[PDB]
Design a protein around this ligand. Structure first.
Ligand SMILES: NC(=O)CC[C@H](N)C(=O)O
Ligand SMILES: NC(=O)CC[C@H](N)C(=O)O
Ligand SMILES: [Cl-]
Ligand SMILES: [Cl-]
Ligand SMILES: [Cl-]
Ligand SMILES: [Cl-]
Ligand SMILES: [K+]
Ligand SMILES: [K+]
Ligand SMILES: [K+]
Lengths: 358, 379, 357, 380
């Protein structure tokens, strides 16, 4: 799935055409198209958890917006397709507007109906059989959580109750016709696991940054590759988690074990569960891993290097202010203003020109 | 819920969903790596008595069409797949996969870890299994059914699938523009090839005709002398299911033709038979070669060809008679794939020159046959 | 199908509710739901030939308008249902909005799909096996003709080519278990024809006004009934053509033969075809039959009374002015003005106040 | 293009489309006017050997369900309709009609002028015909098959559908709220009744059980001696296919019961045998009575009831013995519909008091029987 950055180019034409406008791409692997596709959506790093809705059902104008996005594709068409099915359009209707083979469309419609079922039955309705079937179709715990009105952690927990966990299969070029000694893996909800994690080594996991975007480029990936190169050289068993198909970080030669997976908390926890790393590096892959840091350590993960709290101390506007004052250092005058009027006055006080953060 | 269960001799169970006929199927379980060509595979007679497992998860994406039928029927005993897609999506489709399997009364199962199955077959070798598709499939019974299967080793399946009477074949290859062509009038075709039906694929026939060969398809047990009587320009040995070793009538007829100067070319089974005729030995492979990406080297020219393969037995090279020269070899495992009689106009190939499905890379094999034929008549 | 007159009540709430707002109704009979439903639409007298589109396939806002029309029903929802299918909405989506049982909805969708085919192939694609199919689903010549890009008559001319004409079945209350001596018939594209027209009597046909609507009420029907009664009394065999289920005109005792059919060129010609009447009265049913006059005559029908031409001279503004003038009679000053500027002028001329049509 | 064909003895062709199993079907073609209850119609054993024509154009609108099955199987040999709907639309549906048809292996044909056919059979009377469903149905062949068919006259079909062994029945009638109830404990139902299975409909049994009757279904050829040994509180004669004449064992067994004071009650064929076993004679109707809008007068009460009918044979009232009174009559043709014994406690109805499908109008008839039975145990 391609990664776009139209919000940074407010005045640009955002319709897709024969001239490339994307800035990166994510890749996913699944035992079926549905699983493949949902996993890609969840690691695209756009805040999506799968087919999150773009339009409300309650909007009389929704279909008009919908039809438009289908007919003249933008970066959000994938989500609009599901929106379409949710609003009564048919596969032939969507095809007609988009030209996407029905082979793919029907899969998306099937996934929407299943979502509607989750919405209806609620969490109570999520028995083991149903939940497993959903995990198999690639549904994220977070998406399922939004649907049944609960927190992600609850869905995850339920999965634990049911011993419902994915298995890891290996890439081997030959559909398993020949044995492999490489550990290039992807998660799937299947019967047999090929992870076979070692238990004689001290493992260090390195988390990548997903697809590239403006501001989150190859520079982080480089750092990622270096952590693995260095530590493996030192004798550690290096495990990389990433899903950008363009980089060196996703070349099986770069680490001891490569997990070509979405860099999400759910996906990473599952790896952590079976690898039991001595340590996890979240500081080299950019924003993506940086944001999971707190939740990872809060999830029992051995986060190494600068702590997620210290990170937050720095990223936090007011926490940092404090730090700077404590250190008796110099910082531009600031003020957090909720409303306008207050602005103009606080502004009088800070002194123009000013930098307005959204 | 439409339940299905797959049970292997060893007691391994695979719980799925029924996608074909309701019932039981028993046979030797094999895996095939072809990412396309599922219908062609199913209709290949060589799959008689075997339960076919496809490694590519989505089987049926393009539905089915009569032109993609490699024989008159679906020869596979059963089909094991990972996912049966919601729909068929291809201009050539005339009927969805599940409908078609039912039509043909094929017990079939979907939704199982075919990767796990493949790894087990690869690691421990071929196994017999049973598919039970029904309301409440009995796992003990499927295991018993699986275990009662006698196995392909020592089983002549060629005699089982051969044609009852001999017919004439004059239809060529399909074309996207044309489709399947009307059959030709004997006059249009310069050569008469007598082809032994050991469970022959429509595609080989077609490819021969394309090469201007009128064909007379004869039953598997036909005698050499009865054939000779047709004054054949050339004799062809088809592909086919089961052990070749037990097909004495074949070996026999063959060795006779091999006293003559009549050009002979076999494929697959035909290839194994030609070697047995020459005095070589056959062996049953651990899991066999079933796929459409198998690299075969032409040792003579030192070139590689990507082939379509479907065989579970092979000719042992170390038992080769000096009159048989090794022309081809497998680049995956070193197994023998081609042979040529040093003294006669007799050559054969292990893989499938007619492909269907798969890479057209080995097609040039038929040219060498035709060249021998021309020679023959020249003289 | 109910008949509405909302255009005459511009300031009214035109949404359907528990309080009736319709002014009349039409009825049709077909061997199948689809045939019956399509005959009704074409008998409605609203200018429909069946499921004529209400919105453009290219209007970006179309799905929005369709959705509103389906959710909060107005007199034209039936037409929007079809439009909703042409625009991509599924049966489920239409049901959720309308609450109309899917048994009906799926039937309308199939009619839409078949319309799609016709549009694709056109005329050249109108084989006989397929034209029959279309007829059997209740398709009007005028509808296909629109779809196919031709004239209604081409479609009709075509139907003759293929000897594709309807048959007539009879109403008997018993599903054919008992024979009938009554001639209460409906057209259908089936095998056996039960019309068995007479050959011994002098027949006169009376054309009804279809559903009642403001301006086309019971007064018309009263006249049709009177036409039938008097002519029958006099010894003519009377044939009534009408589809209003509320009236005495469609009561089987009112005439010798009743054809409960849409009052259209098509349906009328098929009757004339087989009946071969001595005369056809088009002057007692209101606007409906009056308008068919000229084309029925062009088509060879034996229209009695005032000629379609004579009717036009009255019905046509200028023709009639011409008539007044010829008679040296008096009419109010008039003028025909295309544009505004020209009006204001012709207007200064004519003299206010004025009556602007 | 999935062809089907209907050819009758007279060689009348009806070209349509296949909607059920592939193959051939042969029997007596009949028309049924019921606008509702086609599944019940098809699962009625009485339809054995006959190819059913439905006058109502749309058939299958509500799909199918189990509770709507009258027997274990689809007794019709065939099915001819005008239109099979695109979908089934009813909360009770469990399977569409084409599907169900295939499942039961029923050759079926649709899209034919069912009216014209109805009119033919009406005017011309019952015809034998054949449906050939397939790729290239052979007219001449079907016609040949049509003609080859023996015909229902003189054909014992009851022995052809009866049970092989006797079973107990204790299941009541369905409800909207509860669907088909759980069979009762014999400790629950007060009266004991024997029911000759001439090709019985579940509804009769159910309605019987509803009345507090424990049933014992016996095969059609059971001896009286054998039955009498059960100490029945009553004996019931069921509905069934074919000619009732040819069923010697029945008349016998019946005559045998008549000799006795035990209450006998027959329905449809059961009614015919009761007549036969009483001295009466049976006849084969030109077209018969097939529908659920059939008016039947109760001569005694001068009352009219709308009834469900399924018969191709009737009893001659000219052939009635003075010991057999006439209790019901058809207002459509004057044909006989009920008779009672002047001497005995026996009565029988030609129509279907259990309906299913149809008007519940004739239900009180079971009320008579129970009366009889209560009386029998008072005196007995
Ligand atoms: N998954 C692994 O640990 C690989 C094991 C072994 N080499 C195989 O290919 O089966
Ligand atoms: N159509 C008619 O002329 C009626 C003929 C006849 N009375 C019948 O009902 O069959
Ligand atoms: Cl569930
Ligand atoms: Cl499995
Ligand atoms: Cl066509
Ligand atoms: Cl017909
Ligand atoms: K493992
Ligand atoms: K499974
Ligand atoms: K027809």
């Amino acid at each position: 799935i391609p990664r776009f950055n139209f919000e940074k180019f407010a005045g640009a034409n955002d319709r897709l055409t024969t001239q490339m406008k994307s800035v990166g791409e994510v890749m996913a692997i699944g035992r079926t198209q549905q699983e493949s596709l949902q996993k890609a959506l969840r690691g695209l790093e756009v805040g999506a958890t799968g087919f999150d809705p773009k339009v409300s059902l309650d909007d009389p104008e929704a279909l008009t917006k919908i039809r438009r996005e289908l007919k003249d594709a933008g970066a959000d068409r994938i989500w609009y397709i599901a929106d379409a099915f949710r609003a009564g359009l048919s596969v032939d209707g969507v095809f007609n507007l988009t030209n996407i083979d029905r082979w793919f469309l029907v899969q998306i419609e099937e996934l929407v109906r299943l979502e509607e079922k989750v919405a209806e039955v609620g969490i109570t309705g999520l028995n083991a059989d149903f939940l497993r079937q959903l995990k198999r179709k690639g549904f994220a715990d977070a998406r399922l959580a939004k649907l049944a009105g609960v927190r992600e952690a609850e869905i995850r927990k339920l999965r634990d109750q049911y011993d419902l966990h994915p298995v890891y299969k290996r890439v081997d070029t030959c559909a398993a016709e020949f044995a492999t000694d490489t550990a290039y893996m992807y998660s799937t909800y299947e019967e047999e696991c090929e992870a076979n994690p070692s238990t004689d080594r001290e493992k260090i996991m390195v988390l990548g940054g997903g697809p590239n975007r403006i501001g989150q480029g190859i520079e982080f990936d480089y750092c990622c590759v270096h952590a693995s190169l260095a530590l493996r050289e030192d004798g550690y068993e290096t495990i990389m988690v990433n899903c950008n198909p363009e980089t060196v970080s996703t070349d099986y030669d770069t680490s001891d074990r490569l997990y070509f997976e979405p860099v999400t908390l759910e996906d990473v926890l599952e790896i952590v569960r079976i690898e039991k790393p001595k340590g996890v590096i979240v500081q080299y892959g950019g924003q993506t891993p940086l944001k999971l840091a707190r939740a990872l350590e809060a999830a029992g993960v051995p986060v190494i290097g600068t702590s997620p709290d210290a990170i937050d101390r720095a990223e936090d506007r007011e926490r940092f202010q404090h730090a700077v004052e404590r250190l008796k250092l110099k910082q531009p005058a600031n003020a957090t203003v909720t409303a306008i009027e207050m602005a103009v006055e606080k502004a009088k006080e800070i002194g123009y020109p000013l930098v307005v953060r959204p | 819920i439409k339940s299905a269960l797959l049970v292997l001799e060893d007691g391994t169970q695979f719980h799925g969903r029924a996608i074909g006929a309701t019932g039981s199927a028993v046979g030797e379980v094999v895996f095939n790596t072809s990412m396309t060509g599922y219908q062609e595979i199913l209709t290949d007679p060589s799959y008689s008595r075997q339960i076919v497992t496809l490694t590519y998860p989505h089987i049926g994406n393009v539905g089915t069409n009569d032109a993609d039928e490699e024989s008159s029927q679906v020869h596979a005993q059963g089909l094991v797949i990972r996912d049966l897609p919601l729909i068929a999506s291809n201009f050539r489709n005339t009927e969805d996969l599940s409908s078609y399997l039912k039509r043909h009364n094929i017990v079939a199962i979907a939704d199982i870890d075919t990767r796990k199955l493949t790894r087990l077959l690869r690691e421990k070798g071929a196994q017999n299994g049973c598919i039970i598709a029904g309301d409440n499939p009995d796992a003990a019974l499927a295991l018993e059914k699986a275990r009662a299967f006698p196995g392909l080793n020592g089983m002549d399946l060629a005699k089982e699938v051969t044609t009852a009477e001999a017919y004439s074949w004059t239809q060529g290859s399909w074309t996207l523009t044309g489709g399947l062509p009307q059959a030709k009038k004997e006059d249009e075709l310069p050569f008469h090839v007598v082809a032994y039906d050991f469970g022959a694929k429509r595609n080989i026939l077609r490819m021969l005709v394309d090469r201007g060969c009128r064909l007379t398809i004869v039953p598997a047990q036909t005698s050499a002398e009865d054939v000779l009587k047709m004054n054949p320009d050339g004799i062809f040995l088809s592909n086919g299911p089961g052990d070749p070793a037990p097909c004495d009538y074949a070996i026999t007829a063959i060795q006779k033709f091999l006293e003559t100067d009549i050009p002979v070319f076999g494929i697959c089974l035909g290839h194994q038979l030609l070697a047995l005729a020459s005095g070589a030995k056959t062996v049953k492979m651990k899991f066999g070669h079933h796929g459409g990406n198998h690299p075969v080297k032409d040792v003579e020219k030192n070139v590689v060809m990507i082939t379509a393969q479907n065989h579970g037995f092979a000719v042992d090279e170390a038992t080769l008679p000096a009159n048989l020269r090794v022309t081809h070899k497998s680049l995956f495992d070193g197994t023998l794939q081609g042979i040529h009689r040093t003294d006669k106009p007799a050559f054969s190939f292990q893989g499938h020159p007619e492909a269907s499905p798969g890479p057209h890379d080995a097609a040039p094999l038929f040219d060498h046959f035709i060249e021998l034929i021309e020679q023959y008549r020249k003289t």
